Amino acid sequence: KNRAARVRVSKGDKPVTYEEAHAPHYIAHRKGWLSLHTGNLDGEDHAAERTVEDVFLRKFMLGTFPGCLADQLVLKRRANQLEICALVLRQLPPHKFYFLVGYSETLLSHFYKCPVHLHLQTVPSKVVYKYI
Amino acid sequence: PEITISDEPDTLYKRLSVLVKGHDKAVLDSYEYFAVLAAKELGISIKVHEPPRKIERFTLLKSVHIFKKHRVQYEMRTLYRCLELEHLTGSTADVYLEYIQRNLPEGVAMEVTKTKLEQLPEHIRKPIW
Amino acid sequence: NHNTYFALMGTLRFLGLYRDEHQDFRDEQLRLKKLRGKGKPRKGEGKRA
Amino acid sequence: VPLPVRMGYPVKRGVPMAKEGNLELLKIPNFLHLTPVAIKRHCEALKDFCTEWPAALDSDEKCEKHFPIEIDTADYVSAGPSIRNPKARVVTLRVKLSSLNLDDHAKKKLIKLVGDRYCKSTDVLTIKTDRCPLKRQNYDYAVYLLTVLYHESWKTEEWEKK
Amino acid sequence: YYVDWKMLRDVKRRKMAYEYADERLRINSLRKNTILPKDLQEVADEEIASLPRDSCPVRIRNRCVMTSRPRGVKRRWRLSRIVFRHLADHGQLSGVQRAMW
Amino acid sequence: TVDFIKKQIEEFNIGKRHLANMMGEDPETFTQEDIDRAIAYLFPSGLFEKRARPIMKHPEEIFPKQRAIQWGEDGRPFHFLFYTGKQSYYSLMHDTYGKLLDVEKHHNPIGSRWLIKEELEEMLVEKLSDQDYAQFIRLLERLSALPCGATEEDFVNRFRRSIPXXXXXXXXXXXXXXXXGMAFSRGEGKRKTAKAEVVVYGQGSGRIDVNGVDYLLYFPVTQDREQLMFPLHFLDRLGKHDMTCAVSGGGRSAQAGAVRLAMARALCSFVTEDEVEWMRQAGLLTADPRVRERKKPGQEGARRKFTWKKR
Amino acid sequence: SFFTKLTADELWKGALAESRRKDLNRGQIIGEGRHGFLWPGLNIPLMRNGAVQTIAQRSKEDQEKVEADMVQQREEWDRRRKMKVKRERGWSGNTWGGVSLGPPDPGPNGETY
Amino acid sequence: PFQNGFEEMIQWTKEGKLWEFPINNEAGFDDDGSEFHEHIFLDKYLQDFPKQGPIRHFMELVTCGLSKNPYLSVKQKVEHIEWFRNYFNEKRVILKESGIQLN
RNA sequence: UAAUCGAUAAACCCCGAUAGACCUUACCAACCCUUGCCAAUUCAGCCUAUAUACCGCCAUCUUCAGCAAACCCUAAAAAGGAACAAUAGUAAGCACAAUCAUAGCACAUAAAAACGUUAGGUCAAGGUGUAGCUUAUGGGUUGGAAAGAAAUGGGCUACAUUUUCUACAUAAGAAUAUCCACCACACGAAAGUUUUUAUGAAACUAAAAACCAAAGGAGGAUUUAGCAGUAAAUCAAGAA
């Protein structure tokens, strides 16, 4: 029985995000990729760096934006700039949201020594794909 | 916008070969469409083709500890489109390619080969030593 | 560099910005372990006594 | 975005999920900025930069008769902090021997001299250059090699008569 | 903190090995030559034997960078099989799909 | 849920305009065919399952049909069979049986099939049982069993469908070469890592050339030459035709077989329309689906397993 | 070792062991910190009588006080979890016989008891 | 303020944060303004050395090695050679003792 | 042996290792260091005890069809609940099925395969609840381990004529276990002794030649695998 990245069947009441409801064998069939970069294509270099980098930005966004994160965080790399999209729940009063926008962009840009672009799409409640 | 003209005899390109690597075939289709539509407007006279797909597979163990009867296998597919342009000027290439590259999607890579036209070097023309 | 990531996010925790759920769990647990009467011995004290 | 769109794999309801908060449409690279109208406009704005192609060059015969040498040069783009790609250095020279001012003796000596880089069927002398960190350098050196090989192919010596 | 003590050790062996790289290279050149005199080569032999051997290349061990696991690492991602799979199966690794054929 | 359909169809049209104006087409002649191209170019998802790819479509194809309001605002139900829990089914049944009865008082292989179960389920907007379906179709057989009136025939036509069947080996028109003014036919076989192309000239010396050398030299294995001989010995043309051949990939038997297929394909221009069905039943023109099976991990030979141990 | 750490939920799964839960999401505001910085958008409203407050640091004692506040918060929550034991007994003790279950549920027709 | 996204990218690029287009991967690396004959042809640094000795064999090898080496500047290539001058010159004894007279 | 751990019916036994000369390394032997990686902390750090506290990843029944909320019925209900000319069952969900992948079909294979079961596997991938260690169950340097009386699991190569050698690709020429004193040869040396070479700071490691040519002459009880491009034979590549 494969336990990989899966969400078990409950008494049937458990709310589930579209992503967490689609099991590993489904990648590239229904589900998409959470990140995008050149590094894994045939002739390409430095895949590892974009992986460490990605991981750290998962943890970073989960920690800078407490309790307000909706679904897993969507990274794109385009021509040396990062485009970080987030689905974010509405909890915070908007001031704090922009505080953290500036905070994040600046901090990251100076950490990875490349320009970062941030996008928050705000959602009233976690989207429910199944059950509920 | 500022244009300048310098007297020097700008570079000719016989063939400009532009390869795009990618994961999703869709993205490379729409990008082909975009490149051909950019080129048609700039009078660039281009062709396109699809080189054979590469699929690299490899194998990991399915458990943390020990069942070596049991594995998982993973893939990466690399899909190709190549835009082959003929009879380009220096500046023409610089602009067209600038427009291409600027709009390059995040999932794809691009490999450019120019074949440049030069008549003959100076010490070889018709001196002999 | 691991010290970089670790220390940077550590400070960024106390500057109030970052929030570490793992170290908070750690914390609360350590507090409840010292509270019941088993903590981490002052270095040198534990054995000989 | 004005356009209502449903993506996602449907539940047995049969409803592909809505366009709001749809993670998997947020993953999709969108060609929106690149909608054909925008392209037309763009290219008309770029027309000013592009410079004309010489008339006569339409046929390869005229290219070869005028410009004998091809210099193949590659350049790569991949997303990430560094723009350094090692593969870029490499330079190629294609040169047709038939376009060359060679003596009989000079041609044959150059063939033996160069070896495999000469294709005896297509008469394409090739030179790949690697050795130097910069592309311009490899260009200079490939030119150097061409120059040198030509200067040396005309020189008869003792052992040649041996 | 690096995740293990083993990691500290190998971080240091990397830094060492970058430090002395050219001493190594230079000295070993004579040592690997059949053209030079043997006499030179013996002294040079004692010389590479001299320099600290935590600074030697083969004493380096690729590990999983996150998880530190000494075997099972895939060279391209510098990751242990478990961690790699873990990522690839949330879909967090780009362009990696479960292979069917 | 009907308010949703009103709203959705409105926004669908507004977004339709919005689509045309950006995509730069006349909003009038815009079709679904154009809708597809449009989205496909705007949101290019490489994804294998095609339902999970982006869609903008008329809500009717998007959403399932609904069962309408079944009772007035007094509580009182419209249809008299409502309490059966399937009105949709038993209405068809009442009507069908009524048709039958009237037929009995009055009376004194085109590729047509009955609906599937799923199609009756779609027609009535009603879940069904196999038994129920079977019952009904049974009844329609009873209907066809008697003298067929006009409205009787229309009635059963509702539940009628029609299916295509196509069998012919597709016949290439020949090609007369300009050089000799002579007719040839060029076949392509593909077997198992090996493709072959065979040009067959209609007036031969019996000459058969392979990759620029003679067929005896290129197939020193007798078996292969026999395989080659098969189509020609079948059609008795053995000396009559002159073939040029180019084959690549795989090992010798695979090659000889590819040439078999390609040749037998290029031989159906110069044969009679009747001998074609023979070559089919001889199995000459059908590819070999047989290929190597991938090793499976944790096994040996794709089938062969590591020796299993009871203890 | 930042790489080694995890999400809270995971830790509580693997703490609880179902094959009581306290939350660390309670009590901590944004920008709240032990080194005691007042960040213009979080700890403090963006503006005072004068506009655009700068980045400021509280005292030693102001921080000792806020920390005392969080400590007393935790104490309050623990007391509130312990006070949660109260009941009305049906027949005897842990016998559920005779225990009031509370009025039945309103039916489909709006009927209410 | 930024009036448009194009404005944004523009300011990034003037600033140096964005890349130049179209990309040349050698951008930002000038390699000292060196030219090919300052890499390939190493005669300069072999001038002080015994010309007929096996030392020439060896150092002609090192020459060829550093002539083919893309990953090094001129200053480093030089340093290698000078390290060999220093090395051989430091041991005069072993040169004399091996059956060849060395300078 | 001074000198790891883990797996160990089916579901261990070329297993964690797609990989131990130093390193890895957790082991033993000696020596050494005590806020001893980090921004701050009577704090660090622990391959120490709990897999019968666990999350993670899996095995297994299993290519098995069932699991499960919400209700409804049963002169009472522990539980049960179908008959299609139908007798109390309705039900969205998760399974199967369907679709995807193996570049067009089709089949085949791949994948998938719930609920549970085996307190099945793993605190040595990592992380944790409970416990313990804190001038040491912590951290370093230097060496040292991995010997065979056997017993057994899986492989490889054979035992030769459907063979062996050379040429060579698939028509050839020779050799062929008994003569006999061969100046031994027929198969079979993957094993050893010697010399090189590859790597490497360090050969104990791999490869190649030269020698040597042994057991083996088709294998007891009993057993493994395969239903077609499969089994069998042959060749090449990659991961580390």
Ligand SMILES: [Mg+2]
């Ligand atoms: Mg399985």
Ligand SMILES: [Mg+2]
């Ligand atoms: Mg190693």
Ligand SMILES: [Mg+2]
């Ligand atoms: Mg086999």
Ligand SMILES: [Mg+2]
């Ligand atoms: Mg009591």
Ligand SMILES: [Mg+2]
């Ligand atoms: Mg054990």
Ligand SMILES: [Mg+2]
């Ligand atoms: Mg055990």
Ligand SMILES: [Mg+2]
């Ligand atoms: Mg077991």
Ligand SMILES: [Mg+2]
């Ligand atoms: Mg095995």
Ligand SMILES: [Mg+2]
């Ligand atoms: Mg060891």
Ligand SMILES: [Mg+2]
């Ligand atoms: Mg220890």
Ligand SMILES: [Mg+2]
């Ligand atoms: Mg025990």
Ligand SMILES: [Mg+2]
């Ligand atoms: Mg267990």
Ligand SMILES: [Mg+2]
């Ligand atoms: Mg478990």
Ligand SMILES: [Mg+2]
């Ligand atoms: Mg069923």
Ligand SMILES: [Mg+2]
């Ligand atoms: Mg029941």
Ligand SMILES: [Mg+2]
């Ligand atoms: Mg298909």
